[PDB]
Design an enzyme around this catalytic site. Structure first.
Site, PDB file in Angstrom:
ATOM      1  N   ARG A  31       0.805  -1.216   0.000  1.00 11.44           N
ATOM      2  CA  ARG A  31       0.000   0.000   0.000  1.00 11.44           C
ATOM      3  C   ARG A  31       0.840   1.270   0.000  1.00 11.44           C
ATOM      4  NH1 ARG A  31      -2.678  -3.642   3.258  1.00 11.44           N
ATOM      5  NH2 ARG A  31      -4.863  -4.078   2.709  1.00 11.44           N
ATOM      6  N   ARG A  37      -9.643 -11.985   2.977  1.00 15.81           N
ATOM      7  CA  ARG A  37     -10.956 -12.337   2.442  1.00 15.81           C
ATOM      8  C   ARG A  37     -11.403 -13.712   2.923  1.00 15.81           C
ATOM      9  NH1 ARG A  37     -11.119 -12.655  -3.851  1.00 15.81           N
ATOM     10  NH2 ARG A  37     -10.022 -14.617  -3.389  1.00 15.81           N
ATOM     11  N   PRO A  69     -10.747 -20.188 -13.254  1.00 24.10           N
ATOM     12  CA  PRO A  69     -12.010 -20.780 -13.712  1.00 24.10           C
ATOM     13  C   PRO A  69     -13.074 -19.717 -13.943  1.00 24.10           C
ATOM     14  CG  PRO A  69     -11.096 -22.040 -11.892  1.00 24.10           C
ATOM     15  CD  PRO A  69     -10.296 -20.772 -11.980  1.00 24.10           C
ATOM     16  N   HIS A 113     -19.165 -26.327  -9.877  1.00 23.06           N
ATOM     17  CA  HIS A 113     -19.458 -24.898  -9.839  1.00 23.06           C
ATOM     18  C   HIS A 113     -19.449 -24.296 -11.239  1.00 23.06           C
ATOM     19  CE1 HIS A 113     -19.756 -20.838  -8.390  1.00 23.06           C
ATOM     20  NE2 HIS A 113     -18.584 -20.509  -8.904  1.00 23.06           N
ATOM     21  N   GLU A 114     -18.450 -24.650 -12.049  1.00 19.58           N
ATOM     22  CA  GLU A 114     -18.363 -24.097 -13.398  1.00 19.58           C
ATOM     23  C   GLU A 114     -19.492 -24.611 -14.280  1.00 19.58           C
ATOM     24  OE1 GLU A 114     -16.355 -21.665 -14.253  1.00 19.58           O
ATOM     25  OE2 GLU A 114     -15.613 -21.680 -12.189  1.00 19.58           O
ATOM     26  N   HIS A 117     -23.076 -22.797 -13.612  1.00 17.60           N
ATOM     27  CA  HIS A 117     -23.444 -21.585 -14.335  1.00 17.60           C
ATOM     28  C   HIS A 117     -24.010 -21.921 -15.708  1.00 17.60           C
ATOM     29  CE1 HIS A 117     -21.527 -19.209 -11.214  1.00 17.60           C
ATOM     30  NE2 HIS A 117     -20.414 -19.904 -11.367  1.00 17.60           N
ATOM     31  N   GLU A 155     -23.496 -16.767  -8.795  1.00 18.12           N
ATOM     32  CA  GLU A 155     -22.566 -17.710  -8.190  1.00 18.12           C
ATOM     33  C   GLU A 155     -23.239 -18.642  -7.189  1.00 18.12           C
ATOM     34  OE1 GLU A 155     -19.297 -15.744  -6.328  1.00 18.12           O
ATOM     35  OE2 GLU A 155     -18.184 -17.585  -5.897  1.00 18.12           O
ATOM     36  N   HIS A 161     -11.827  -6.092  -6.663  1.00 20.45           N
ATOM     37  CA  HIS A 161     -13.196  -5.776  -7.058  1.00 20.45           C
ATOM     38  C   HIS A 161     -13.450  -4.274  -7.101  1.00 20.45           C
ATOM     39  CE1 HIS A 161     -13.443  -9.990  -5.754  1.00 20.45           C
ATOM     40  NE2 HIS A 161     -14.476 -10.087  -6.571  1.00 20.45           N
ATOM     41  N   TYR A 194     -21.235 -10.888  -2.746  1.00 20.88           N
ATOM     42  CA  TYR A 194     -20.650 -11.926  -1.905  1.00 20.88           C
ATOM     43  C   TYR A 194     -21.386 -12.081  -0.579  1.00 20.88           C
ATOM     44  CZ  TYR A 194     -16.767 -11.822  -5.208  1.00 20.88           C
ATOM     45  OH  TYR A 194     -15.997 -11.886  -6.345  1.00 20.88           O
TER      46      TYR A 194
END
Lengths: 597, 97
Positions: free
Chosen positions: A151, A255, A328, A356-357, A360, A384, A487, A497
């Site tokens: 930073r 995160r 992914p 997961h892929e 979608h 998601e 993001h 999220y």
């Protein structure tokens, strides 16, 4: 003669033209991501500008059809996105400089790096370089050098670029008759036109705040459990009633806590469930990984995958000659063209990622019959969330014993299940306070309640209250934490999220009640059950053509978000954490600081 | 495997808009600009004036459901004219004595 006839005629022709250009625009990005060439980089910018300028030219004719004379709900929703002029409402000087700041902040994030203090010659980039080291690093100084020095040349450098980013995006919302830019992202949940199902934009602020109150008692027991494990390492810097350091969260921004699952294992004397070593003996390749996952969608009643889907899939990266992004992602082009770009190795995570892929792609097949304007998720969180509930049923020991990955003689008891619920909690439970913290901070700065000097003053002050994290080195107003985030700098939705966790657990509880599953929720498996897939397929084909509050009632019977499925699925873990935290202090204080004694 | 090619085929068009519905066994080749509202068009594109013919995107990469199908429709009509076309016949062996 009526406006409805003129508006529907404009929408009937626009659905064809917008669908043709969006396919070529997504195809140019597909050839560029799978292959790096000088021809594909030009085709992506050419096809991308043709589709971007196409919505700008059609926005002129869209504002000439007022929605007051249209009594149809499906027509007003198709004209809702076309009514906004995007960046055309901004001045010519502010419109051109807007794309410059977005491209500059994205370039600095990609080209940013931190040189090794011990080795000034070697300088490693953040991704993958610094993100990989911060995962497995147990050192106190090694983690602080990469966390603090980043930073300095990034957060302090992006501060004048972030100040311009706030001013430019606020002028767009004012011309769109929005209160602020923070209300712009809250407009995705906006629902109007139906009696009783109307959802105000300002209601989301009270919704995320009220649901987070019931999250606190679950998060305080987990935060005290992680602190008790790391207390023996540094008892001076880590106080029992204090907060954990920011650099020890397992990665740069804290995160996900999954990186800490190694040291937090409650019982190390028992084996863990892993399908990696099982797939090696079975000798499976990337072709049969997607094939076994396709049968999972057939057992629930959902349609299978088209022949063009499996044929056009990219199963690996052919060296450095032709390079493809291994991140992914599920790319939806259009007109039934479904492709996924992922680098498929043999690991336990790639098995859950395949569900997961493909989730979608399976999600896009239901509403594919809708017009191009009506093809989308009902909100930003449903995208998601549909792919995650497919992976949750696959991670259960019941589904693993069905296809032969896990041995049928494997002992399943409380000691094995508590170890599994803790790994998911670090990714899930740890995400909610961090996502509620940064998103609420953006809404307060974009509104104007926080002066430019108090950005960092309120950032770390509210951080000890929510996630219970204090900075080792105090920072002034020059640094900006969200400026370095992926993001925020790339202008992507950060609220998707938080709501995703609440939406995926509601669907997990509803589908297991339809198939008459008994026992704890983490023991549920939706495979071989065709009753749950039928109730879900009704909502999946609606998209955003119907209010998300109405489509949510057709599944879980709830008109809004609810914490009850969040507590019930984590209830077996919550009872074990309460007994282990009796010897420690439940909760933390915001008056403790590592440099203030 | 035939019509669709790399880059798209714009040769095949279709009529998207018409003021009313066609009658059975009617073919309309008119290229006149469709007028949705009361705004005059006069062959010039603009507000409430749309070019009816649209293009079929043809590439091998599209999904199977939307792949173009060549359709051959046989119209069977029995009129008062003498019948000519008939089904195929069959010839057997010839035996004597």
């Amino acid at each position: 003669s009526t406006i409805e006839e003129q508006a529907k005629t404009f929408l009937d022709k626009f659905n064809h033209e917008a669908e043709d250009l969006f396919y070529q625009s997504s195809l140019a990005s597909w050839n560029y991501n799978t292959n790096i060439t000088e021809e594909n980089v030009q085709n992506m910018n050419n096809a991308g500008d043709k589709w971007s300028a196409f919505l700008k030219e059609q926005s002129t004719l869209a504002q000439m059809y007022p929605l007051q004379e249209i009594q149809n709900l499906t027509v007003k929703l198709q004209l809702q996105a076309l009514q906004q002029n995007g960046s055309s409402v901004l001045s010519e000087d502010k419109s051109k400089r807007l794309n410059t700041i977005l491209n500059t902040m994205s370039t600095i994030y990609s080209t940013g790096k931190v040189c090794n203090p011990d080795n000034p010659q070697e300088c490693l980039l953040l991704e993958p370089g610094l993100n990989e080291i911060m995962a497995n690093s147990l050192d106190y100084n090694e983690r602080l050098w990469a966390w603090e020095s980043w930073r300095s040349e990034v957060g302090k450098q992006l501060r004048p670029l972030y100040e311009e980013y706030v001013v430019l995006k606020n002028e767009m919302a004012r011309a769109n008759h929005y209160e602020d830019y923070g209300d712009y992202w809250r407009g995705d949940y906006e629902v109007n036109g139906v009696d009783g199902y109307d959802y105000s934009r300002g209601q989301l602020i009270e919704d995320v705040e009220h649901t987070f109150e019931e999250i606190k008692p679950l998060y305080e027991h987990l935060h005290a459990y992680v602190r008790a494990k790391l207390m023996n390492a540094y008892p001076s810097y880590i106080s029992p009633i204090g907060c954990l350091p920011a650099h020890l969260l397992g990665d740069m921004w804290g995160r996900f806590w999954t990186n800490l699952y190694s040291l937090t294992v409650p019982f190390g004397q028992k084996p863990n469930i892993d399908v990696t070593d099982a797939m090696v003996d079975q000798a499976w390749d990337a072709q049969r990984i997607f094939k076994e996952a396709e049968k999972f969608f057939v057992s629930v009643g959902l349609p299978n995958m088209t022949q063009g889907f499996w044929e056009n899939s990219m199963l690996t990266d052919p060296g450095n000659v032709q390079k493809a992004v291994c991140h992914p992602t599920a790319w939806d082009l259009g007109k039934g063209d479904f492709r996924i770009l992922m680098c498929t190795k043999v690991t336990m995570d790639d098995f859950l990622t395949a569900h997961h892929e493909m989730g979608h792609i399976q999600y896009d097949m239901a509403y594919a019959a809708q017009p191009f304007l009506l093809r989308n998720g009902a909100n930003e969180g449903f995208h998601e969330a549909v792919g995650e509930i497919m992976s949750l049923s696959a991670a259960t020991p019941k589904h693993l014993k069905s296809i032969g990955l896990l041995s049928p003689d494997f002992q399943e008891d409380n000691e094995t299940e508590i170890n599994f619920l803790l790994k998911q909690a670090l990714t899930i439970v740890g995400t909610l306070p961090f996502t509620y913290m940064l998103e609420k901070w953006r809404w307060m700065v974009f509104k104007g309640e926080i002066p430019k000097d108090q950005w960092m003053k309120k950032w770390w002050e509210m951080k000890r209250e929510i996630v219970g994290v204090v900075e080792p080195v105090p920072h002034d107003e020059t640094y900006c934490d969200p400026a370095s985030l992926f993001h925020v700098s790339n202008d992507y939705s950060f609220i998707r999220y938080y709501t995703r966790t609440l939406y995926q657990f509601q669907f997990q509880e509803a589908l297991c009640q339809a198939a008459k599953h008994e026992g704890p929720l983490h023991k549920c498996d939706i495979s071989n059950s065709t009753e749950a897939g039928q109730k879900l397929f009704n909502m999946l084909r609606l998209g955003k053509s119907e209010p998300w509050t109405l489509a949510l009632e057709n599944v879980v019977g709830a008109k809004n978000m609810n914490v009850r499925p969040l507590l019930n699925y984590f209830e077996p873990l919550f009872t074990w954490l309460k007994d282990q935290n009796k010897n420690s202090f439940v909760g933390w204080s915001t008056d403790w600081s590592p440099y203030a004694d | 495997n035939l019509d669709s090619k790399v880059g798209g085929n714009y040769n095949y068009l279709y009529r998207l808009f018409r003021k009313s519905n066609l009658k059975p066994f009617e073919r309309d080749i008119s290229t006149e600009i469709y007028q949705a509202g009361s705004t005059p068009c006069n062959g010039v594109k603009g507000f409430n004036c749309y070019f009816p013919l649209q293009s079929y995107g043809f590439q091998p990469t599209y999904g199977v459901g939307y792949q173009p199908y060549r359709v051959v429709v046989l119209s069977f009509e029995l009129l008062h004219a003498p019948a000519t076309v008939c089904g195929p016949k069959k010839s057997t062996n010839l035996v004597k004595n």
